[PDB]
């Protein structure tokens, strides 16, 4: 079981715009010194992305910001962060976050990384914590309280043990990371990239592709997600609840993916240097149609345009009289093959919908018309002809 903390403040969420980041290899083929056009899921350039905080400092004019709410998943998610120490261990992916459904999990506990697509039961604010002055020496180890339930489930994993530094410093951020999560068919694909930085604030601008890292056969229903954080000792003696303890110095960003058409640039060693969004500015559109990054003086044609209609009109005669269909079919006399049985049908609104499920017929073949579109369609001079024939002579 976990605890409920209430010591934070209120602060507007605000947005920020993302530069040319979010390119990844879309297949397993090899190319060199060739411009190629691909159609897949991507993140448009110069788009708004939500901006979050987790910072605590000062006691006179300080602020206790602590962001980890629920956010939608949609077709894809773009994730990034900057920090100095080791924060934000992992993520939880689910659909309703209770026992009755199965939700995957990724965890880092300073010794191993645990992946278990499984069933659980999480509380309001699961997290992990660290302690200072352990009284057992070597410092900086603590526990975690995330899930209070479990169940036997399909797939689990555990990684080789490793040793990590858990100090926590102050100053300009010196790290950055990126991740792209997409769910297709019944597989789960992830990508990553690491780069040193020497910036104090805000995401930088640049260009760097990503490489596939792990793919997993899962096939679960995924609709929502949430982020895990960490915290230092409270350096006080409250009831272990109503206290967010101490927040570090880190932030993270969230975007989304949409279908777009791109063209990519390569090199003799491979790799990707830059690209152009065909659907960005009018100028960038002409670059796509000429397969080049440089154009000369002149006039070119790119595409066309149309006016989209905004209303639908249906005009029919306003008569609603029913028709004698049942009396013809449910006759107890019928006729013979010597004389054809002819009966006309006219001036009556029909209803062929019941002649599909409530007909209870054996053979039903329609020639020249779709059987499911009789109601939408209309005709004239419709007749009714029948005769008696042997069972095996229907063909």
């Amino acid at each position, epitope marked *: 079981q976990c605890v409920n903390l209430t010591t934070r403040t209120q602060l507007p969420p605000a947005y920020t715009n993302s530069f040319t980041r979010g390119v990844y290899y879309p297949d397993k083929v090899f190319r060199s010194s060739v411009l190629h056009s691909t159609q897949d899921l991507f993140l448009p350039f110069f788009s708004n992305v939500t901006w979050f905080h987790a910072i605590h400092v000062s006691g006179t004019n300080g602020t206790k910001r602590f962001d980890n709410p629920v956010l939608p998943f949609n077709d894809g998610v773009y994730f990034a962060s900057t920090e100095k120490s080791n924060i934000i261990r992992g993520w939880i992916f689910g659909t309703t976050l209770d026992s009755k459904t199965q939700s995957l999990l990724i965890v880092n506990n300073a010794t191993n990384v645990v992946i278990k697509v499984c069933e659980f039961q999480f509380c309001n604010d699961p997290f992990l914590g660290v302690y200072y002055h352990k009284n057992n020496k070597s410092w900086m180890e603590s526990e975690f309280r995330v899930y209070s339930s479990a169940n036997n489930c399909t797939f689990e994993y555990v990684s080789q043990p490793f*040793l990590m530094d858990l100090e926590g410093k102050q100053g300009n951020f010196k790290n950055l990371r990126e991740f792209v999560f997409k769910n297709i068919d019944g597989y789960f694909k992830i990508y990553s990239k690491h780069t040193p930085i020497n910036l104090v604030r805000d995401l930088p601008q640049g260009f760097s592709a990503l490489e596939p890292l792990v793919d997993l056969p899962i096939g679960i229903n995924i609709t929502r997600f949430q982020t895990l954080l960490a915290l230092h000792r409270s350096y006080l003696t409250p009831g272990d609840s109503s206290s967010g303890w101490t927040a570090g110095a880190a932030a993270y960003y969230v975007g989304y993916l949409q279908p777009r058409t791109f063209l990519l640039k390569y090199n003799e060693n491979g790799t990707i240097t830059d690209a152009v969004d065909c659907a960005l500015d009018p100028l960038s559109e002409t670059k796509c149609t000429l397969k080049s990054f440089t154009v000369e003086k002149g006039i070119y044609q790119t595409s066309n345009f149309r006016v989209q209609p905004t209303e639908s009109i249906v005009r029919f005669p306003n008569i609603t009289n029913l028709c004698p269909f049942g009396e013809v079919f449910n006759a107890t006399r019928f006729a013979s093959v010597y004389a054809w049985n002819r009966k006309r049908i006219s001036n009556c609104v029909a209803d062929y919908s019941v002649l599909y499920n409530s007909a209870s017929f054996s053979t039903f073949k329609c020639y020249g018309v779709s059987p499911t579109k009789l109601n939408d369609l209309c005709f004239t001079n419709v007749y009714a002809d029948s005769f008696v024939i042997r069972g095996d002579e229907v063909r």
Partner: T-cell receptor
Framework: QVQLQESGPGLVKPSETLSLTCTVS??????????WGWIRQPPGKGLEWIGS?????????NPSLKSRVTISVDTSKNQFSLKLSSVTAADTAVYYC????????FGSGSYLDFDY | DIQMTQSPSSVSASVGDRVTITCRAS??????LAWYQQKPGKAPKLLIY???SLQSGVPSRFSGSGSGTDFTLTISSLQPEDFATYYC?????????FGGGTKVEIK
């Protein structure tokens, strides 16, 4: 990565100064978040781990012969060193440098295995 | 603490053959192990990592079946260059120690 160049003296009498130092080029030391150490091997015989060091302290020492073993790192240059002023009579060997593999995910170190 | 032992030593063969080495343990160490080869006159490489996994463009054909306590290593062919000493090392506890070492040389 064409790195770990090592230099040291040739002949040292028993109970006198012993100094080793290892210089790395092609990636710097402060920027990385990895671990470093040494490994010793007498002629013939096998090989035995001697220590491990992280930048900004937090050393680690083998239980044996731990007393007079010290690892020091200076960030001004890309170097670190170990000191054994009083020598064990049978320390004649060949001394190596090492680097610890990086953690597959994220950016942590260890895995307790060495490369390069 | 934990001590590892290697049973064979000085196993020889020719160009077309198939050899096998085994490294024993004294504790759990489930599926965490390492291997090395020391080409004479140089410093060792790593090749196999963990249990049954390669590393960094090794010429392959070197596989080690996993186990719980005592593990194994096999090769399927030999070359006029595969001539060195082999070691096994565990990666579970902190006071990490190497094995004895086996010698392989062609004839």
């Amino acid at each position: 990565q064409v790195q770990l160049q090592e230099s040291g003296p040739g002949l040292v009498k028993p109970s006198e100064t012993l100094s080793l130092t290892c210089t790395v080029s092609g990636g710097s030391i402060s920027s990385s978040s990895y671990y470093w150490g040494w490994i010793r091997q007498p002629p013939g015989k096998g090989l035995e781990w001697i220590g491990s060091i992280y930048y900004s302290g937090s050393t680690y020492y083998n239980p044996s012969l731990k007393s007079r073993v010290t690892i020091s790192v200076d960030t001004s240059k890309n170097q670190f060193s170990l000191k054994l002023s009083s020598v064990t009579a049978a320390d004649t060997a060949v001394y190596y440098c090492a680097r610890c593999r990086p953690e597959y995910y994220f950016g942590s170190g260890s895995y307790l295995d060495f490369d390069y | 603490d934990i001590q590892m032992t290697q049973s064979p030593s000085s196993v020889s063969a020719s160009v077309g053959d198939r050899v096998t080495i085994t490294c024993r343990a004294s504790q759990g160490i489930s599926s965490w192990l390492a291997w090395y080869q020391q080409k004479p006159g140089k410093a060792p490489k790593l090749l196999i990592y963990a249990a049954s996994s390669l590393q960094s463009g090794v010429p392959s054909r070197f596989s080690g079946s996993g186990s719980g306590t005592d593990f194994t290593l096999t090769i399927s062919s030999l070359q006029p260059e595969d001539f060195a000493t082999y070691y096994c090392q565990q990666a579970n506890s902190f006071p990490l120690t190497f094995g004895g070492g086996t010698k392989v040389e062609i004839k």
